[PDB]
Design a protein around this nucleic acid. Structure first.
Lengths: 138, 176, 73, 195, 49, 56, 123
RNA sequence: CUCCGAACGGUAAGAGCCUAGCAUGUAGA
RNA sequence: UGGUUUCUCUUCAGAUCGCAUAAAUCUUUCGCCUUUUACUAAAGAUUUCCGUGGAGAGGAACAACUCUG
């Protein structure tokens, strides 16, 4: 894939080069998957699932492990390795394992509330194996 | 009868599998003498019977659009949409020179980009000849390697337009 | 030089100036230069009379202003 | 009837219907095919014709401007050498061509206009269009497009000729375009329509 | 109507630019008017013969 | 004109005479348009072998 | 002709290998033509070496409209094929330009009751 | 001298037979 | 005294709000005109759209760097 900047990315990008390439090749193979098998919105579920794992790799390298530099962190967010809004929602203590950024939108639901993805299982009902249609999982 | 020979089996790369050729060519091929005698019944084993009998490689000819049986068997194969093993069987079979050419047209139209370069590359080593119907209806001699290189050339085949995902140089940087 | 107006349906109407002794294959190349299609996929028609690909314009007596109904094959 | 009316033209549309009232225009094509067959049968011995065997056709054959099938064909006997394709007035003919055994003649009348008085150019145009890229039922080696303009009363033909048929068809076309039983009924309908 | 005007204005109709402009407009209007009575498809180049 | 056996009718066109036999009201349970693909390895490869054996 | 067919198949495959090798070399020749033209303008010759001509695909042969002939354009849809049907110098009187349009009394642009534009193209 | 027009006013009128690319996504027991 | 930004919503805009500039409508004018719409541009004022300006309200990013005084 083209980096779309051509501006000589700094050190640490070669350390995260094959890891981000394997996640990018997984999303491109998921984007080339046909519409068979998925019912109506299940085909967009591996699109957010590969995007959720791509944002978790950069955030763990910056906040958890703190091994990547801040100059390589800003170059990764600008080139499109991880969304800045997804890292902003994970900075708050109220949401650290959110499914998708579409599930946190208050205006998305018809009843004007959150989804089942942003709800714990202990506070939910007993018999419920439901999954979020907009987000993708719990 | 003419919509699709499968109810829900698979789909083409960008549209219906029946709407892969041009609509001006598909409307004239749907009303033909060779088509009406074949579209009343056509199976997987019956597709191998009609393709082996015909020895011609071309598309439309004449004033009115008169489709060749090579293009007529290509539309009946695309409407049937067989498995990838049956399409690989028709390309590897040496029972007829037109049988391998009929499988190559279904491979370059509906197959994947990596599968098209993998299947059409052993077909370039064939030195046999075939007869091709020209624009004026006369027959013209065309080699098997000449027709296989034309499928990997620019989109100028007889009623066929389907570019690959990349060229041979751009695919060489990613894979073999 | 006759100005044959290849006026098809749905807005596609262009003027095509060709010589009298010019063949019909040269006329389809000039008609495609103003319409925007492949010249091999253009079939000219005048009440179910599909023209050939080798007969000159002087044989059909197509004078100046003799419009044609263009169609696509 | 095959008369092409370009505009709406409500006056002259009905007047052509009044001229072509019954099946008269189709009866003209049956009369010319019968008259040329009678001239061919009267001289079939010296012309080496086996049997003048003009087969049936579609009844709306003259109405259809697209196809042109063999109407009045003539089986030659043996060793018949076809000639180079030429018009019905080119006296510099050459018989250096292929040698066939079946030969046809397709008559197609055409009611012309002011910009279509080139009946000699129209005869070679309809023959060369309906020869190779015709998709029509016709015998392969040679034919004859003996055309007869109904408007300007012009008679012309084009195609590959037979030896001795070029003065034969020229003498027959004078007795077919003039004093025909169908054309005299056609001239009586126009003069009664115009008074 | 034209023979009554051209004969009575024999020297006048040639030496008046506004009078000749009325004749070229009216004669083109009547040839437009007589052509509509034949057919109503607005012909491009009607024959003057 | 033609003559339909099962449909009991008479058409004039060639494709209409074939369509009146298969594709009509009488052709519902008589070979309907819903066809079925065969085996890609069993039925397909045996037809290529039977075509080579009958020709040679 | 089995040995002749193997020679022609080796002739076409060698040209196909030469076509693929010249295809990747076409990107190298495009940068080389940009490098040669940049050095030609810089330090080759101050208006003393051009080494080229006026190579245009379709010919620019034109003429002159007589007095009110229509602006007939060739159409900008196929300009790379360089066919012989295009180079014909379209400045011929087609339908109504055969007249001289100077003996005519004042002006006759269009006599079809649609003269929206009021111009003669002198101003 | 280089100012390039499009549609409507238009193909009828009918008898018997033949085949098709379409659409809805329900409450009920 | 204490905040650089960004996104949502509430008014008036008489500043080339626009250092540049589209379409439609209404009332009058010209040219063609053959039924009409598509027409040509002169005057004036009514909308729509491409946009914008100060001033309160709610979120996010270092608001803390300490900005003017």
């Amino acid at each position: 894939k083209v980096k779309r900047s051509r501006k000589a990315p700094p050190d640490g990008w070669e350390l995260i080069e094959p890891t981000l390439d394997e996640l990018d090749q997984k999303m491109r193979e998921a984007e080339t998957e046909p519409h068979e098998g998925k019912r109506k919105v299940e085909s967009l579920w591996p699109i957010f699932r590969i995007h959720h794992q791509k944002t978790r790799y950069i955030f763990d390298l910056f906040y958890k492990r703190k091994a990547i530099s801040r100059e390589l962190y800003e170059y990764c967010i600008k080139e499109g390795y991880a969304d800045k809004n997804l890292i902003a929602k994970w900075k708050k203590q109220g949401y650290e394992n959110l499914c998708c950024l579409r599930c946190i939108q208050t205006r998305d639901t018809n009843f004007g509330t959150n989804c089942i993805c942003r709800v714990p299982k202990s506070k939910l009902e007993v018999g419920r194996i439901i999954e979020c249609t907009h987000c993708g999982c719990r | 009868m003419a919509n699709r020979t499968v109810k829900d089996a698979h789909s083409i790369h960008g549209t219906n599998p029946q709407y892969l050729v041009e609509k001006i060519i598909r409307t004239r091929i749907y009303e033909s003498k060779y088509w009406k005698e074949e579209c009343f019944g056509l199976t997987a084993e019956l597709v191998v019977d009609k393709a082996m009998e015909l020895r011609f490689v071309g598309g439309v000819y004449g004033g009115n659009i008169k489709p060749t049986p090579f293009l007529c068997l290509t539309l009946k194969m695309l409407q049937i949409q067989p498995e990838k093993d049956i399409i690989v069987e028709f390309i590897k079979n040496e029972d007829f020179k037109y049988v391998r050419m009929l499988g190559a047209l279904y491979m370059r139209l509906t197959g994947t980009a990596i599968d098209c370069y993998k299947y059409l590359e052993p077909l370039y080593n064939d030195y046999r000849k075939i007869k091709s119907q020209n624009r004026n209806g006369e027959f013209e001699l065309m080699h098997v390697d000449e027709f296989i290189d034309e499928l990997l050339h620019s989109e100028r085949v007889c009623d066929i337009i389907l570019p690959r995902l990349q060229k041979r140089y751009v695919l060489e940087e990613a894979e073999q | 030089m006759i100005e044959v107006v290849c006026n098809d349906r749905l807005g596609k109407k262009v003027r095509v100036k060709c010589n009298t002794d010019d063949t019909i294959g040269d006329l389809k190349k000039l008609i495609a230069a103003q319409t925007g299609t492949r010249w091999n996929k253009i079939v000219l028609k005048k009440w179910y009379t599909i023209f050939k690909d080798h007969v000159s314009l002087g044989d059909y007596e197509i004078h100046d202003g003799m419009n044609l109904e263009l169609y696509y094959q | 009837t095959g008369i092409f009316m370009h505009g709406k033209i409500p006056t002259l549309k009905i007047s052509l219907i009044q001229i072509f009232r019954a099946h008269l225009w189709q009866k003209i094509h049956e009369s010319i095919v019968m008259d040329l067959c009678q001239v061919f049968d009267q001289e079939l011995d010296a012309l080496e014709i086996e049997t003048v065997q003009k087969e049936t056709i579609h009844p709306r054959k003259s109405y259809k401007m697209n196809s042109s099938c063999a109407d009045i064909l003539l089986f030659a006997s043996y060793k018949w050498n076809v000639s180079r394709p030429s018009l019905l007035a080119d006296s510099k003919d050459v018989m250096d061509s292929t040698t066939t055994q079946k030969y046809w003649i397709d008559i197609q009348l055409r009611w012309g206009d002011y910009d279509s008085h080139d009946i000699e150019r129209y005869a070679r145009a309809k023959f060369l269009d309906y020869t190779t890229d015709n998709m029509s039922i016709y015998p392969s080696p040679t034919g004859v497009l003996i055309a007869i303009d109904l408007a300007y009363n012009l008679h012309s033909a084009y195609g590959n000729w037979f030896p001795g048929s070029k003065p034969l068809i020229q003498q027959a076309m004078a007795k077919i375009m003039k004093a025909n039983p169908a054309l005299y009924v056609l001239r009586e309908r126009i003069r009664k329509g115009l008074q | 109507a034209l023979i009554g005007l051209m004969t009575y204005f024999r020297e006048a109709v040639v030496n008046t630019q506004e009078l000749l402009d009325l004749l070229v407009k009216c004669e083109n209007k009547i040839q437009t008017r007589i052509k509509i009575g034949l057919n109503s498809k607005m012909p491009s180049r009607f024959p003057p013969v | 004109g033609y003559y339909c056996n099962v449909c009991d009718c008479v058409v004039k066109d060639s494709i209409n005479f074939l369509d009146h036999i298969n594709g009509k009201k009488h052709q519902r349970n008589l070979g309907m348009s819903m066809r079925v693909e065969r085996s890609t390895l069993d039925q397909v490869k045996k037809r290529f072998e039977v075509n080579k054996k009958k020709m040679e | 002709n089995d040995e002749e067919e193997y020679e022609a198949w080796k002739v076409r495959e060698l040209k196909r290998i030469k076509r693929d090798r010249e295809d990747r070399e076409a990107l190298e020749k495009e940068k080389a033509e940009i490098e040669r033209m940049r050095n030609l303008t810089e330090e080759e010759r101050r208006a003393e070496l051009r080494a080229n001509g006026k190579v245009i695909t379709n010919k620019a042969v034109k003429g002159k409209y007589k007095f009110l002939q229509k602006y007939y354009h060739r159409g900008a849809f196929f300009m790379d094929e360089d066919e012989e049907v295009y180079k014909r110098d379209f400045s011929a009187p087609t339908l109504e330009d055969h007249f001289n349009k100077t003996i005519l009394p004042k002006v006759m642009q269009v006599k079809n009751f649609g003269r929206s534009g009021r111009t003669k193209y002198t101003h």
